Design a protein around this ligand. Structure first.
Ligand SMILES: CCNC(=O)c1noc(-c2cc(C(C)C)c(O)cc2O)c1-c1ccc(CN2CCOCC2)cc1
Ligand SMILES: CCNC(=O)c1noc(-c2cc(C(C)C)c(O)cc2O)c1-c1ccc(CN2CCOCC2)cc1
Lengths: 218, 218
């Protein structure tokens, strides 16, 4: 019996470590990670927007279309949430598999031809750019036709997409939870986040909301 | 400027994690790791034996040719030492790079064609079979023409081959230090090691020594 034929998703976490090494060596300015996450959220928002055009009940799970950035300073986590179409369990497996396969292609090309700062133009590298600032990621998603699921890059053992009985309920859409590297904590600060959004995501056609909790120093 | 072209050694640790996942799924019986380590030691012993044939001073750094297995129960480490030719710093870099490149080939083939228990016949898979029982490895080596060097698969950060100012002095040769998985501690036991050596390494033409420290229970 044969194992792993075509089963690239089984290696998603390992392939991400290869891509993290490449992309962090190539890009010293990490801030483009946020552009890429917002662009992927925008695409998922377009999908629900067009489906709901002929079937508005699809919006009732989360009637507003938005992208929402929530720094969690105590946890050193940056959360990016959208109310896009979301992913069923099978969608999440299939999308991670495609992302993983594109990573193998980008990694093999780096070895054969070398990598430079144009690599951000390659399919899938936008996802891996989250590892410019994060050492670990949780991808949480809720599609109208399925339950809430989560994939954790740091989960020990076999690749798994787990029924989410732990995180807050998304009504619909996707949240990436970025566990930031100790040298990239600037991206938990409101001023820095706003600078990066205005610089790189001006033409995104959805509201980008920033949720900031701070103790009042008295 | 281009990064990583041909620099497969830079990914040795990440490629090993891919190979570890494949080989542990394919092989439920882990014991062949020892056959493969002994076979690589035997090859390095042949090289010093033939060089010393015309230049016996090469043996003076370690005059006996042997393979030596040392369980370190307290550390959950199994050490395999040989008095082979050893590797200079550049040899260790070059051999890890070749091993890493063969891993990329085996991993891509597993995805395209599937992997089965014949994969042990592929170039380089013998090295990766150490991850049947170990989660981490240190490769320590001393060649007559260089200082003692070490590579650590679990060392954080950039691939590096470090001048060894920590471990015991090898006079000449190579030691792999295997940090065993919690479910593979049977391979620290003398009875088990001896069974595996007799079964799989009968035709190795060097003495295989086993060094066992035990408290006398009184
Ligand atoms: C069944 C259809 N479902 C979706 O399209 C969907 N729902 O949520 C998606 C998001 C995925 C990501 C990461 C995992 C790529 C987000 O960061 C944000 C999302 O909303 C998401 C999505 C899926 C794929 C893509 C496009 N690819 C292109 C190649 O790599 C990155 C993503 C963009 C968004
Ligand atoms: C400059 C020449 N130096 C040597 O040949 C040498 N010295 O020490 C060697 C050992 C390497 C390993 C691992 C890292 C492969 C050992 O386990 C034991 C050795 O003695 C070693 C060696 C190097 C290469 C090989 C053969 N390859 C074949 C493909 O993968 C495994 C190793 C076998 C042994």
């Amino acid at each position: 019996n044969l194992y792993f034929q075509g089963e690239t998703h089984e290696f998603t976490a390992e392939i991400s470590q290869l891509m993290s090494l490449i992309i962090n060596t190539v890009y010293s300015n990490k801030e483009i990670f946020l552009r890429e996450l917002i662009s992927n959220a925008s695409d998922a928002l377009d999908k629900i927007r067009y489906q709901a055009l002929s079937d508005p009940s699809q919006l009732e799970s989360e009637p507003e279309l938005f992208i929402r950035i929530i720094p969690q300073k105590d946890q050193k986590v940056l959360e990016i949430r959208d109310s896009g179409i979301g992913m069923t369990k099978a969608d999440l497996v299939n999308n991670l598999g495609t992302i993983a396969k594109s990573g193998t292609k980008s990694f093999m090309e780096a070895l054969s031809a070398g990598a430079d700062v144009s690599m951000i133009g390659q399919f899938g590298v936008g996802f891996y750019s989250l590892f410019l600032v994060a050492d670990h990621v949780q991808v949480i998603s809720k599609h109208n036709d399925d339950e809430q699921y989560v994939w954790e890059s740091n989960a020990g053992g076999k690749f798994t997409v787990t029924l989410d009985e732990t995180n807050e309920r998304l009504g619909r859409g996707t949240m990436l939870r970025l566990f930031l590297k100790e040298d990239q904590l600037e991206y938990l600060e409101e001023k820095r986040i706003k600078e990066v959004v205005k610089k790189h995501s001006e033409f995104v056609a959805y509201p980008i909301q920033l949720v900031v909790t701070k103790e009042v120093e008295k």
